[PDB]
Design a protein around this ligand. Structure first.
Ligand SMILES: [Mg+2]
Ligand SMILES: [Mg+2]
Ligand SMILES: [Mg+2]
Ligand SMILES: [Mg+2]
Ligand SMILES: [Mg+2]
Ligand SMILES: [Mg+2]
Ligand SMILES: [Mg+2]
Ligand SMILES: [Mg+2]
Ligand SMILES: [Mg+2]
Ligand SMILES: [Mg+2]
Ligand SMILES: [Mg+2]
Ligand SMILES: [Mg+2]
Ligand SMILES: [Mg+2]
Ligand SMILES: [Mg+2]
Ligand SMILES: [Mg+2]
Ligand SMILES: [Mg+2]
Ligand SMILES: [Mg+2]
Ligand SMILES: [Mg+2]
Ligand SMILES: [Mg+2]
Ligand SMILES: [Mg+2]
Ligand SMILES: [Mg+2]
Ligand SMILES: [Mg+2]
Ligand SMILES: [Mg+2]
Lengths: 141, 62, 99, 8, 140, 144, 68, 206, 72
RNA sequence: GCGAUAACGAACGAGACCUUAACCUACUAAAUAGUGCUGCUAGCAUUUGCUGGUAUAGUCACUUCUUAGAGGGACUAUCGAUUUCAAGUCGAUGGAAGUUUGAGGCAAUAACAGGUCUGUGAUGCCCUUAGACGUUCUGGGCCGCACGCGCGCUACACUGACGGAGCCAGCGAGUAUAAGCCUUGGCCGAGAGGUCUGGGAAAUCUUGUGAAACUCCGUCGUGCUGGGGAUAGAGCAUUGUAAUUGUUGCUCUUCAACGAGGAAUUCCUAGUAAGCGCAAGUCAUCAGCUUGCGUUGAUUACGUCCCUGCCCUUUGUACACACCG
């Protein structure tokens, strides 16, 4: 029997793929990661300032692995949450488009995903190869 | 010195709003000295309710 | 050809009579058929206020308009399929034939 | 009460 | 073909469709082992139909379910029903039904919802209030 | 990432930009006592000064403290975006600024009289002490 | 409550006065029997009438019932 | 006793549940018994469950609530005060932690203390009011076992809620303190103060 | 306004901690704050290290609740 | 309804009826629904296995899930209790469903000076009708603020806030020479938003509307504190001829009352209450509003006439325009 992405916990797989992508260092991180908030509905920037971009990229790659041609508009809806309108009731607002779009461009340029026909972004021929290894080095403990 | 009395017959709802029920109790030991008492919560027959005091019967409530 | 016939109406008995009669006519005639395919019926709902004015308890009407759509695929030449449509004309059901 | 009065 | 029966479990709107194949005892939820269904405080709800009868019955069969609709909790009750329903339906068809009647007694004696779908659905909302029974506060 | 001890280096009361800061508050949220310094702004200057947020206010040395007051007073020189600033596209010189504790209310008034000097509608309503942005007053703001 | 109405009580006891030998103590058999005996417009009412005729038949074997 | 190997590997500890069904796979119902003859039939510990979440229909008929597990009735009463209604998974997590804290403390069976704390919390005589359209005339009457049992759960959880308000102690461990103290009949606990005051007033009406 | 829990750990407080925490039936986030008069954030870092040194055995690990007991 | 019976035998209303939700491996089919195999194909351990993509020619098979038409199914069925042994009621068992199965639609005989002539090219009469009270244009107002009241939304924190991560519904709507619909995908932009292409008059595309509560891991640590986010300054976009009296959205800063609320008082019995969002209506732009929908999901009765309102009988009446007599 083999190991797949679906055979590993979502929560501890992403912190493990996130740690690996930072020490490897080839993921290109945009220069505003220390300034911006993930969503317009959020009110504060991420608490893990140095590493938050890598962990989010690990989540995006894994999320795209389990699906087919996910677009950039769909990633903003997924990570968006309820906005704290002051006295008005809460509502769902999408996440930042640039942060997710830059991430897919950065992950596409490190080789894990690529633009699929009929829109979206499939996971790459090598994207399956190298995510499934991370799954194996996840379950040895 | 509390005494326990198994219920043998639900007579009916009493009290102004109907929130308390008259019941006919039978003692677990010495299966006699059957007494009529009022109970607050919902009651079917054969529920064993303990009595802080035994020597007092009950009649209709206002 | 592969010819598709789309059936829509508000009332189902006359639509279903036409649907069954065409398949029946597509049965004695040795024509391969696919259908009828029952599309999820559409409930056109309009919720108005009962009061023409604005007095009384706030009571509402809830009107409805059921729309049923069925498509049947027939594999026959276009001349054969078209004469079936005029044999099975019913006022309620409208018919469109698309290749 | 009411009754239109003009200025020009 | 092979030893196949197909069944489904339901909750309010969630529906879990079970495929029961002959095999090594592979049990997956949407392609993932049941050991990792995120409603975790409730992971034993789907472990219940397994441990009550014993995991040895699942040596020869593998189960892959597809659950859609409903919510996170509503999906667990639909999933545990589809698997339980699948084991009984497999036994009626490829083993004697006397054993099938054995499995059916324990499931029902423990929890009816393992085999019988729960009929509760949401009551429609009526005007004059924000809910099925709740009404707008009245003022005089 | 585990427990450490120190003696005599902690400072209970800080004084920055003529405002008193409690030294036992986390540094990012301690600076928010400075008027003109919100949670979003204090979070960024600490990250620009390489001052780790896991530190209380009293833990910082003066060199670090001086490194923060320079950045808040000169944000654009320290890669702090203009849209992130308090008072951007200034009225008189047209440049991007960020006013602080005593300067904020001085230039906020100067904006108010500048409204009153032109006899604008918004400046007048500020004078009356009412809401200026079109809120209904029939039923709200009845306190004093 | 589950109180049967007059359209079912008098209609159920007329069945007994006219077709008692063919009737029975089984609701399922009576329900099928009443589809050829009475012209009932709705299925639920057919089952309702047959369900009350069976109850009356089950009661006649314990003695004579009043009104039939 | 044998370990059964499946294609989807199943951890060793959780499969050691085929022998016995235990709450959170940690707590056994075998050694728990109600130390009250009068509440045995309305505190339900005979049918074991793994997690205190069954989503059953106990509101259809009249006494179906008594057949619900006593722990599920407890986790049901936790979700109160508006903002917590419907948050059962939170209630099970809260109950689950309380049981662990009750185990490290007093070292007894956590589900035994729950039954003892509930039996020790129900007032045996309450003074119902019999006012004839306004006048004060209370009369002391007895309390049935179900209202005695289910008011204990209401009082036990109500006291824990208020003790955890504006308090660093978590609700699970405010509940743990509330449950142990009521279990030992201690007057420090809420719902024992309340139970004592009702039975004291009822004696002052007969 | 009466809390004023200590947030800076000195050495007298440090070794008194290592002298008192072992003599606890049950320790958690609230227990260190309640009885050692230390702050909540300092308590969370104290439990995660004392566990790595073996004085305290993890009964249960969770973000909102940390249930611990003595190792003796 | 049973029963008693100078009544007997009937009608409307109730009930029946209709719509909707829950069951059908029993029929009818489905390339606008889904599945197994099979072509071709990817990743991981090599045991033949586990996850995928592709597939409107594999010119496959099938209808469990999905859709909808013809039916079936529940009648309180069977058995125990109580009852005038009647109508019935309460328990179990079976069952998808045993509170009229849940919820609605329709709904009698009359009646109220109830509300609408501001929905009507529905109307009688009265008023106006060329300096119009008609109609139209420009601008303002309907938002105006010492105050009283009603339907509500946020909250007063730790059963919590943030910060990451997990990630599930159902009801619906959608355009052309327009006067512009739903809008994916790509590219810019911190955001709001912009731009370039494409699909969909629709079970096909938006869309699995990847919604929010919720769950996990962290920071916070009882502090008007990282609760709460009014009020306001400065700036960036969107709709619109036109935003000033900020239409709306976004960024930074400002961060008020509020520390669970007196007398009183509202709604509610099971997928119900409570939370939590989403769609449709209004809509060039604006939803703290309604109409629905689903997600999470209880406590407590299953009783009474004590309060409040209504219905029936008896009774008094100088009322019948009927006590507003
Ligand atoms: Mg776009
Ligand atoms: Mg989300
Ligand atoms: Mg999220
Ligand atoms: Mg909030
Ligand atoms: Mg207003
Ligand atoms: Mg079917
Ligand atoms: Mg009417
Ligand atoms: Mg009126
Ligand atoms: Mg009119
Ligand atoms: Mg108005
Ligand atoms: Mg209203
Ligand atoms: Mg959250
Ligand atoms: Mg859907
Ligand atoms: Mg504050
Ligand atoms: Mg806040
Ligand atoms: Mg806008
Ligand atoms: Mg709208
Ligand atoms: Mg409105
Ligand atoms: Mg009643
Ligand atoms: Mg009654
Ligand atoms: Mg009365
Ligand atoms: Mg008189
Ligand atoms: Mg007269």
């Amino acid at each position: 029997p083999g190991v797949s992405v679906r055979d590993v916990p979502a929560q501890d797989f992403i912190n493990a793929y996130a740690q690996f992508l930072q020490r490897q260092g080839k993921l290109e991180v945009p220069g505003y990661v220390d300034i911006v908030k993930t969503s317009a509905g959020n009110d504060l920037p991420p608490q893990e300032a140095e590493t938050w971009f890598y962990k989010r990229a690990a989540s995006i790659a894994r999320h795209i692995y389990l699906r087919k041609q996910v677009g950039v508009g769909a990633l903003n809806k997924l990570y968006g949450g309820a906005k704290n309108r002051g006295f008005r009731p809460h509502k769902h607002v999408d996440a930042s488009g640039s942060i997710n779009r830059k991430c897919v461009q950065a992950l596409q340029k490190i080789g894990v995903l690529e633009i699929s026909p009929k829109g979206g972004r499939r996971i790459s021929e090598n994207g399956q190869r190298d995510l499934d290894r991370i799954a194996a080095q996840t379950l040895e403990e | 010195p509390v005494t326990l009395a198994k219920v043998i017959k639900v007579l009916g709802r009493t009290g102004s709003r109907g929130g308390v029920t008259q019941v006919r109790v039978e003692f677990l030991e010495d299966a006699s000295r059957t007494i009529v008492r009022n109970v607050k919560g919902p009651v079917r027959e054969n529920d064993i309710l303990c009595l802080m005091e035994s020597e007092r019967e009950a009649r209709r409530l206002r | 050809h592969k010819i598709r016939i789309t059936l829509t109406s508000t009332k189902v008995k006359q639509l279903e009579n036409v649907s069954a009669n065409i398949i029946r006519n597509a049965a004695q005639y040795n024509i391969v058929k696919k259908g009828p395919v029952r599309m999820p019926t559409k409930v056109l709902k309009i919720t108005t206020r009962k009061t023409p004015n604005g007095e009384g308890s706030k009571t509402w009407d809830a009107y409805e308009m059921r729309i049923h759509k069925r498509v049947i695929d027939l594999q026959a030449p276009a001349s054969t399929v078209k004469r079936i449509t005029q044999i099975t004309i019913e006022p309620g059901v409208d018919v469109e034939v698309t290749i | 009460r009411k009754k239109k009065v003009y200025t020009t | 073909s092979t030893q196949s029966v197909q069944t489904f479990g339901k909750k309010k709107t969630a529906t879990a469709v079970a495929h029961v194949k002959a095999g090594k005892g592979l049990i997956k939820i949407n392609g993932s082992p049941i050991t990792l269904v995120q409603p975790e405080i409730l992971r034993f709800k789907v472990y219940e139909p397994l441990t009550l009868v014993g995991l040895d019955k699942f040596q020869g069969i593998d189960i892959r379910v597809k659950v859609t609709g409903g919510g996170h909790v509503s999906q667990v009750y639909a999933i545990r029903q589809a698997i339980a329903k699948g084991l009984v339906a497999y036994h009626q068809k490829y083993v004697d039904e006397a054993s099938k009647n054995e499995l059916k007694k324990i499931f029902a004696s423990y929890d009816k919802t393992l085999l019988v779908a729960d009929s509760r659905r949401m009551e429609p909302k009526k005007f004059g209030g924000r809910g099925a029974r709740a009404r707008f506060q009245k003022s005089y | 990432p585990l427990v450490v001890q120190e003696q005599g280096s902690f400072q209970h009361i800080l004084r920055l930009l003529n405002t008193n800061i409690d030294g036992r508050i986390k540094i990012m949220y301690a600076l928010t006592k400075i008027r003109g310094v919100g949670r979003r702004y204090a979070n960024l200057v600490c990250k620009k000064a390489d001052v780790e947020l896991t530190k209380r206010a009293g833990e910082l040395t003066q060199e670090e403290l001086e490194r923060i007051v320079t950045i808040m007073q000169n944000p654009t020189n320290y890669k702090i975006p203009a849209w992130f600033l308090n008072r951007q596209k200034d009225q008189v010189d047209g440049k991007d600024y960020h006013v602080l504790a005593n300067n904020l209310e001085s230039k906020l008034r100067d904006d108010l009289e500048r409204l009153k000097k032109i006899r604008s509608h918004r400046g007048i309503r500020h004078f009356w002490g009412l809401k200026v942005r079109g809120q209904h007053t029939k039923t709200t703001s009845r306190g004093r | 409550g589950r109180v049967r109405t007059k359209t079912v009580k008098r209609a159920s006891k007329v069945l007994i006065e006219r077709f008692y030998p063919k009737l029975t103590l089984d609701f399922e058999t009576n329900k099928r029997l009443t589809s050829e005996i009475a012209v009932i417009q709705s299925k639920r009412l057919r089952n309702k009438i047959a369900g009350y005729t069976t109850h009356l038949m089950k009661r006649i074997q314990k003695g004579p019932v009043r009104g039939i | 006793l044998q370990v059964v190997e499946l294609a989807t590997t199943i951890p060793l500890d959780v499969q050691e549940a085929q022998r016995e069904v235990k709450l959170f796979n940690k707590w056994s119902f075998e050694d728990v018994e109600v130390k009250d003859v009068s509440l045995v039939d309305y505190i339900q510990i005979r049918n074991p469950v793994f997690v205190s979440h069954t989503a059953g229909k106990y509101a259809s008929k009249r006494f179906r609530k008594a057949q619900c597990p006593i722990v599920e009735r407890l986790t049901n009463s936790l979700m109160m005060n508006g903002r917590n209604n419907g948050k059962k998974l939170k209630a099970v997590r809260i109950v689950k932690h309380a049981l662990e804290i009750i185990h490290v403390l007093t070292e007894q069976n956590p589900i035994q203390v729950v039954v003892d704390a509930i039996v020790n919390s129900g007032a045996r005589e309450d003074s119902t009011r019999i006012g004839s359209s306004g006048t004060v005339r209370r009369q002391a009457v007895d309390v049935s076992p179900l209202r005695r049992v289910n008011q204990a759960i209401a009082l036990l959880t109500i006291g824990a809620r208020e003790a955890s308000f504006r308090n660093i102690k978590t609700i699970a461990e405010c509940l743990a303190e509330e449950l142990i103290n009521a279990a030992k009949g201690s007057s420090t606990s809420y719902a024992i103060k309340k139970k004592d005051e009702l039975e004291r007033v009822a004696k002052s009406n007969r | 306004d009466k809390a004023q829990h200590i947030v800076i750990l000195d050495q007298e407080k440090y070794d008194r901690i290592l002298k008192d925490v072992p003599t606890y039936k049950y320790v958690s986030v609230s227990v260190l704050v309640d009885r050692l008069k230390i702050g909540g954030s300092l308590a969370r870092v104290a439990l995660r290290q004392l566990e790595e040194d073996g004085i305290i055995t993890p009964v249960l690990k969770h973000s909102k609740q940390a249930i611990y007991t003595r190792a003796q």
